[PDB]
Design a binder for this molecule. Structure first.
Ligand SMILES: Nc1ncnc2c1ncn2[C@@H]1O[C@H](COP(=O)(O)OP(=O)(O)OC[C@H]2O[C@H](O)[C@H](O)[C@@H]2O)[C@@H](O)[C@H]1O
Length: 232
């Protein structure tokens, strides 16, 4: 049985949950979260993938095929939504019912059932992670994390730990990351990238064999260059 939250445990939520759903939408929503990993989603008549040519694990290139650690890390030029991995990361807020930035894009692509699922829990604390189905994303699951506002390294680190912990607890083998806290939350990019990479490296060293790919999705060229520069 899945661990769906890393931490310890509304009229808007009420409105969302009372909104009409079709039988076909109900059928997708009814899929036990743990079954979604392996289900043939095309067997559900209400499902589709909303990303036409998703980028799969075998299409990514590791930073370095020969390093023990960097063979499990890839950089990707583009939105995290393109990635067909076990899980993608959303940079949410504590309410965790959508927003702008990557949170907006993920909800657009995933479709309205993602926000419906989010309304079943009481948001998400800073540094923690909530696990939901990915609905219309090529990715299976979303790991919604809430990064700090401003440079609070231990919370940003916590975010990365919480994400990687839930993937480990539930047997997710590949994760697509976005640059959490670095857009509207204004965490400085190079310091944020250091943490993202430092934490993923530490996790990979301790839990080698649990994960096959940590892909860092760089929606902006300067994120991609910062990541590139950080990994030699
Ligand atoms: N349209 C997009 N598509 C894909 N990736 C994007 C997009 N826009 C930004 N990114 C990338 O997404 C990454 C994260 O930037 P941010 O989304 O700002 O998140 P945060 O943690 O700093 O701010 C969170 C708040 O913003 C939201 O309103 C939430 O609801 C929160 O309230 C960067 O790589 C961006 O380039």
């Amino acid at each position: 049985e899945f661990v769906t939250y890393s931490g310890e445990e509304s009229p808007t939520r009420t409105r969302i949950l009372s909104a009409a759903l079709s039988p076909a939408e109900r059928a997708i929503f009814d899929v036990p979260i743990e079954k979604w990993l392996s289900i043939d989603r095309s067997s559900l008549s209400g499902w589709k993938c909303a990303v036409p040519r998703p980028v799969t694990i075998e299409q990514l290139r590791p930073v370095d095929p020969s390093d023990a650690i960097l063979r499990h890390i890839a950089l990707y030029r583009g939105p995290v939504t393109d990635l067909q991995l076990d899980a993608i990361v959303n940079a949410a807020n504590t309410r965790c019912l959508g927003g702008g930035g990557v949170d907006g894009a993920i909800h657009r692509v995933a479709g309205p059932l993602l926000l419906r699922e989010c309304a079943t829990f009481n948001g998400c604390q800073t540094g923690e992670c909530r696990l939901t189905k990915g609905y219309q994303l090529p990715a299976r699951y979303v790991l919604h994390t809430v990064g700090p506002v401003g440079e609070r390294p231990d919370m940003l680190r916590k975010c990365y730990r919480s994400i990687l912990s839930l993937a480990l607890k539930n047997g997710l083998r590949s994760i697509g990351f976005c640059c959490v806290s670095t857009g509207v939350y204004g965490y400085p990019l190079l310091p944020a990238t250091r943490i993202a990479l430092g934490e993923t490296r530490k996790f990979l060293e301790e839990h080698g064999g649990a994960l096959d790919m940590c892909c860092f999705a760089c929606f902006q060229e300067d994120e991609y260059k910062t990541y590139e520069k950080c990994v030699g």
